[PDB]
Design a protein around this ligand. Structure first.
Ligand SMILES: CCCCCCCCCCCCC(=O)O[C@@H](COC(=O)CCC)COP(=O)(O)O[C@H]1[C@H](O)[C@@H](O)[C@@H](O)[C@@H](O)[C@@H]1O
Lengths: 529, 59
């Protein structure tokens, strides 16, 4: 149904300015409840996702005349701050309609600037840009969260060089010395907006945001992340890396010198080595518990779904899994079992492997490790199916071809054919067996199909994939550093506010009211002509 | 500090030829000791890396 589709709505929709003017002059109302099921969101089905307000239609259709006309109605003035069923205003509508293209970006940027300045001039006391929708998002936060990179890029650095309008600007150029220009960015609600800052929503997205990788490349955010890196996060991160390395060393030493008797636990003696060993064990288990609770805290503060859990946040999953293995080892240690060694070694191997987590923060090593992670996930799921089909087929063929009253098992034959991958195949591992010619034909066919053709194809395809991820690796590394910075500043372990940029600097000194304004401006020096 | 940043430096810096001609005819000196800590080199801090001479500004 098309509930609320009044004549004014249709006149605007059809781009008939004459009808719009006549209906408005005749007293047609603006606050139309265009709440029909057609006019709701979910554009996948037939519908109109940016309705529920004729101002939203007037702005979204790129017609300046209509929106400029509704500023001063003859009968009933329009209100820009009018909210639809989900709290969205005209600005939220302008954000939502974007598709991240150059022409659409131009149109949406133009309309956004014009509508915002007109609303400010009509109502200087009302800060339209700060109004939140039902989800608690400003249009800036909505653009950042939803994936509208173009509008975000505009908003973060818009400026107006006019009197009584510059106080609405984000970017300023207050000082210049010949070719040198000292730009300022207010950057409110980027470091913190008390609920959801721009960095928080970009970094901790659900992984469905198409541009979560590209948003952090913009002018102010990249410099902010670099500044926070250089300020205090670099030291804390390297310190954590050092502590983790010491933890792994202690764990390895504890594991290597474990006792060799049966049926734990094992009691301390009057010697000295046992005290070092049990100290190492206690420190290891303490580390395991710490990572256990870190994993839980990560989960609870995010609650991602299956479609987001196993496609993102691999490092937290791996550290948590390490913790699980160590705790199972503890349980078995006290449960009078030998099998604690198995879980302990799996934990140890995973801990040393997870040492690669810290390559983030180092440029070249981090890019390298990201490429490895992506070329594991993309390649094993494609390769191992093909390889295992070949291996299993020829293993069953050979093992069922040979039999006597030693290689009568599918396990051993699977192993002997696996060896051909690592350059230790024999080509003769049985003798006097029936159908020698068939056996040789099968092995040679296996070797040609797998060793000579398949592995070389793996190398070639990995080459292609490498060629196609030079840039995605850089973006992902920057994102990983962003996650590290945000987590470190969010916790910080001291309950201190070190995330501030420059203090309450007197950026503007003017508002519509006769007052000054301090806006936490961050300075950037550039040189140009 | 901006030691020696006389009006001639500012007229040249702003590319205002009228002020340059007026100041020169009025007797503004050329060999200005524009040795201000800002106006000298050391680009790493805020500064002006091609100062200490108004002819350097002119060029
Ligand atoms: C019995 C013995 C078994 C040993 C098993 C060993 C496995 C390999 C060990 C791999 C070592 C590296 C590592 O452990 O770290 C890698 C994860 O590698 C894997 O994928 C392992 C697949 C399996 C990065 O982890 P991260 O959580 O940073 O993922 C990034 C997100 O953060 C971010 O939001 C972005 O979404 C970004 O696109 C993501 O990449």
């Amino acid at each position: 149904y098309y509930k609320g589709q009044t004549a004014l709505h249709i006149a605007i929709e059809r781009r008939n300015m004459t009808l719009v003017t006549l209906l408005v002059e005749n007293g047609a109302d603006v606050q139309a409840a265009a709440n029909g099921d057609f006019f709701k969101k979910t554009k996948g089905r037939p519908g109109f996702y940016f309705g529920e307000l004729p101002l939203s239609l007037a702005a979204c259709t790129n017609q300046l005349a209509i929106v400029k006309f509704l500023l001063q109605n003859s009968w009933q003035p329009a209100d820009i701050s009018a909210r639809d069923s989900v709290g969205n205003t005209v600005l939220h509508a302008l954000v939502e309609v974007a598709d991240n293209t150059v022409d659409n970006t131009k149109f949406v940027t133009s309309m956004y600037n014009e509508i915002l300045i007109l609303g400010a001039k009509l109502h200087p006391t009302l800060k339209l840009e700060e109004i939140t929708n039902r989800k608690g998002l400003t249009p800036l936060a909505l653009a950042a969260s939803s994936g509208k990179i173009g509008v975000l890029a505009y908003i973060l650095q818009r400026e107006i060089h006019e009197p009584e309008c510059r106080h609405l600007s984000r970017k300023f150029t207050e000082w210049a010395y010949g070719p040198v220009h000292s730009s300022l960015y207010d950057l409110s609600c980027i470091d913190t907006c008390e609920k959801n800052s721009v960095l928080e929503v970009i970094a901790y997205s659900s992984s469905e945001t198409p541009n979560r990788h590209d948003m952090l490349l913009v002018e102010p955010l990249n410099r902010l992340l670099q500044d926070k890196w250089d300020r205090f996060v670099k030291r804390i991160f390297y310190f954590n890396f050092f502590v983790y390395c010491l933890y792994m060393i202690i764990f390895t030493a504890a594991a290597y010198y474990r006792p060799v008797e049966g049926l734990p636990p094992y009691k301390l003696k009057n010697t000295v080595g046992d005290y070092f060993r049990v100290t190492g064990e206690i420190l290891s288990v303490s580390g395991g518990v710490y990572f256990f609770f870190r994993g839980i805290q990560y989960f609870l503060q995010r609650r991602p779904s299956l479609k987001s859990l196993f496609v993102d946040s691999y490092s937290e999953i791996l550290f948590f899994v390490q913790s699980l293995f160590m705790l199972v080892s503890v349980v078995l240690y006290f449960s009078q079992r030998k099998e604690y060694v198995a879980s302990m070694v799996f934990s140890l191997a995973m801990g040393w492997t997870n040492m690669l987590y810290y390559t983030r923060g180092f440029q070249q090593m981090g890019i390298y490790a990201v490429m490895i992670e992506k070329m594991i996930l993309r390649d094993l799921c494609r390769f191992m199916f093909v390889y295992l089909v070949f291996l299993f087929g020829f293993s069953t063929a050979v093992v069922t071809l040979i039999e006597d009253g030693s290689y009568n098992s599918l396990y051993s034959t699977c192993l002997e054919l696996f060896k051909f991958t690592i350059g230790m195949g024999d080509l003769e591992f049985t003798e006097n067996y029936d159908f020698k010619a068939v056996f040789i034909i099968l092995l040679l066919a296996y070797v040609i199909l797998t060793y000579i053709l398949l592995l070389n194809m793996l190398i070639a395809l990995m080459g292609e994939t490498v060629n196609k991820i030079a840039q995605e690796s850089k973006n992902i590394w920057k994102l990983q550093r962003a996650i590290t910075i945000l987590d470190t500043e969010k916790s910080f372990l001291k309950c201190m506010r070190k995330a501030f940029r420059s203090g309450k600097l007197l950026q503007v000194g003017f508002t519509p009211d006769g007052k000054d304004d301090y806006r936490w401006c961050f300075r950037v020096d550039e040189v140009n002509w």
